[PDB]
Amino acid sequence: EIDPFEMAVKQLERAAQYMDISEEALEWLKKPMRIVEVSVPIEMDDGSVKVFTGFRVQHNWARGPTKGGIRWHPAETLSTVKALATWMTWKVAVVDLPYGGGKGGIIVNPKELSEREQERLARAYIRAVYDVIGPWTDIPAPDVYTNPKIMGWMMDEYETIMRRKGPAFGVITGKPLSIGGSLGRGTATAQGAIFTIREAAKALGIDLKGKKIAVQGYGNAGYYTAKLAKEQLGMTVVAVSDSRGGIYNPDGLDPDEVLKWKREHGSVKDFPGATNITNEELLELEVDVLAPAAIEEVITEKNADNIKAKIVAEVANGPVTPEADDILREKGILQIPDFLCNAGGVTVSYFEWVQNINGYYWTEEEVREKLDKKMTKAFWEVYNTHKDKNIHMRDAAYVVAVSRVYQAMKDRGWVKK
Numbered sequence: 140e141i142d143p144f145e146m147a148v149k150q151l152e153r154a155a156q157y158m159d160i161s162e163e164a165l166e167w168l169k170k171p172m173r174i175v176e177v178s179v180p181i182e183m184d185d186g187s188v189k190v191f192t193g194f195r196v197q198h199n200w201a202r203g204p205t206k207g208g209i210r211w212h213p214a215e216t217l218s219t220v221k222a223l224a225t226w227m228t229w230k231v232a233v234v235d236l237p238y239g240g241g242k243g244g245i246i247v248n249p250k251e252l253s254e255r256e257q258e259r260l261a262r263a264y265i266r267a268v269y270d271v272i273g274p275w276t277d278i279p280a281p282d283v284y285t286n287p288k289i290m291g292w293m294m295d296e297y298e299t300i301m302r303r304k305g306p307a308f309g310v311i312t313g314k315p316l317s318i319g320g321s322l323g324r325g326t327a328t329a330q331g332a333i334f335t336i337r338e339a340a341k342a343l344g345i346d347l348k349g350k351k352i353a354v355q356g357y358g359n360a361g362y363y364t365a366k367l368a369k370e371q372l373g374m375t376v377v378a379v380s381d382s383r384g385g386i387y388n389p390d391g392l393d394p395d396e397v398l399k400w401k402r403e404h405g406s407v408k409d410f411p412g413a414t415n416i417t418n419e420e421l422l423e424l425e426v427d428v429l430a431p432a433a434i435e436e437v438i439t440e441k442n443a444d445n446i447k448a449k450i451v452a453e454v455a456n457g458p459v460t461p462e463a464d465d466i467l468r469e470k471g472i473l474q475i476p477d478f479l480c481n482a483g484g485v486t487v488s489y490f491e492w493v494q495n496i497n498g499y500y501w502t503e504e505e506v507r508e509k510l511d512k513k514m515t516k517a518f519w520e521v522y523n524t525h526k527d528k529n530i531h532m533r534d535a536a537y538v539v540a541v542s543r544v545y546q547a548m549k550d551r552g553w554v555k556k
C-alpha cells in the first residue's frame with residue numbers, strides 16, 4: 140500500500156534523475172545513517188507500568204546536527220519516521236540551514252493519557268534517547284499531537300541528565316518563551332509563505348497590491364496566511380474555507396472577523412455578506428494567488444486543468460499530485476513547492492536554536508527580517524534552477540537540496556565520487 144519509505148526513496152531517485160550524482164552517493168542517501176528504536180516505560184496513574192515503542196531516526200548529518208520533530212500517534216511506524224526524516228533532510232537543505240535530517244516518534248494514543256502520564260512519557264523518551272541527541276547532535280521539535288509543553292518537559296529532563304554542562308536550552312526547539320523560547324514561532328509558516336509569494340510575484344512581474352487570493356483551510360497556517368497577505372502584500376482575501384465548507388466575497392474578507400465568527404459559530408460558513416461555496420468551488424475561482432493550507436492531495440488530475448490561479452502557494456504538505464503538477468506547469472502557472480513554501484517553521488526553529496546556543500535572544504523584527512532574507516534567497520535559488528534546467532519547480536527544489544547534501548558529503552570525504 141505504497142510504503143512511506145518506498146515513496147521517499149522513489150522521490151529521491153526521481154530527483155537524482157535530473158542531476159549529476161554518483162551511484163555511491165545515491166546509495167548513501169537511500170539509507171538513514173542511524174536508526175534508534177527504544178522502549179519507553181512509564182508508570183500509569185493506576186500504578187501499573189506500560190512500555191511504549193519510541194523511535195529516533197537520523198537520516199543524514201553531513202551539513203550539521205540533525206533536525207526534526209517527534210510524533211505521538213497510535214499509528215506510528217518506523218517506516219513513517221524514516222520517510223519523514225528523509226524529507227526533513229531536504230527541507231533543511233533547500234533553505235540552506237546547517238542541519239541534517241532527523242525524526243522521532245512514540246506509538247501511543249495521547250488522547251487517553253493524563254497530564255502526569257504525558258510528562259512521564261516525555262521524560263522517559265528523553266532518558267531513552269539521551270545518548271543520540273544533543274545541542275550539536277540532534278534537535279527535536281514539536282509535531283503531530285505534541286506541543287511546547289512537552290518540549291519544556293523534555294528540555295527539563297535533558298538538562299537534569301546533562302547536569303547543566305552546556306546549552307541545554309538548545310537541545311530542543313518549540314519551547315515556551317519563559318524557557319528558551321523564540322518570538323515569531325506562531326506565524327512562522329505563514330510568514331515564510333508570504334515572503335515566497337511576494338518573491339514569486341516579483342519573478343512573474345505582478346504587483347500584488349489590489350489582487351485576489353483564495354486560501355483553503357483556515358487553521359493556524361491558513362488564517363495567518365490570509366491575514367499576513369492582506370496586511371503586508373495588500374492582497375484582497377476573497378475566499379476562505381474550513382472542513383465544513385467555504386465562503387466567497389468579491390469585495391473582500393476581514394480575516395479577524397472571519398476568525399471571530401469561526402470561533403463563535405464553530406465554522407467559517409454562513410459568514411455575513413459572504414456566499415457559501417464548496418472547497419472544490421474555491422479551487423475553481425479566478426484568483427492570482429491560491430494557498431492550499433489544508434488536507435493533502437486537494438489538487439489532482441481531475442481538477443488540475445480547471446485551476447485559474449497564477450501562483451499556487453503549497454502552504455500545506457503536498458496538496459498537488461505529480462499529474463496535477465505536470466498539468467499545472469503546462470498551463471503556464473508557477474508553483475511554489477510544498478517543502479519550500481512552508482519552510483518558515485523549520486527556519487524559525489533554527490533561529491530559536493541559534494538564540495539558545497548564543498545565549499542572546501532576538502526580537503520580533505529581527506526574526507522577521509532574517510526569515511525574510513532566508514526565504515528570499517531560497518526561493519530565488521530554486522527559481523534560478525527552475526529556469527536554467529527547464530524542469531518543474533518541485534524538481535528544481537529537490538535538485539538544490541540534494542546538491543547541497545551531496546556537496547557536503549563530498550567535502551567531508553564520505554563519498555569519493
Ligand SMILES: NC(=O)C1=CN([C@@H]2O[C@H](COP(=O)(O)OP(=O)(O)OC[C@H]3O[C@@H](n4cnc5c(N)ncnc54)[C@H](OP(=O)(O)O)[C@@H]3O)[C@@H](O)[C@H]2O)C=CC1
Nearest residue numbers: 328356357358359360381382383432433434454455456484
Ligand atoms: N501551522 C504550522 O505551524 C505548520 C503547518 N504545516 C502544514 O500546514 C497545514 C495547516 O497547518 P495547521 O494550521 O497546523 O493545521 P490546523 O490543524 O491548525 O488547521 C487545519 C485547517 O484545515 C482545515 N481542514 C482539515 N481538513 C480539511 C479538508 N479535508 N478540507 C478543507 N479544510 C480542511 C481545518 O478545518 P476545521 O477548522 O474545520 O477543522 C482547519 O481549518 C497542514 O497541511 C500542515 O501539514 C506544517 C508546518 C508547520
Ligand SMILES: N[C@@H](CCC(=O)O)C(=O)O
Nearest residue numbers: 206207208280484485488
Ligand atoms: N517537525 C516540524 C518542526 C520543525 C523542526 O523540525 O525543527 C517541521 O518540520 O516544521
Ligand SMILES: O=C(O)CCC(=O)C(=O)O
Nearest residue numbers: 208223281282283456484
Ligand atoms: O509534520 C509537520 O511538520 C506538520 C504536519 C501537520 O501539521 C499536519 O500533518 O497537519
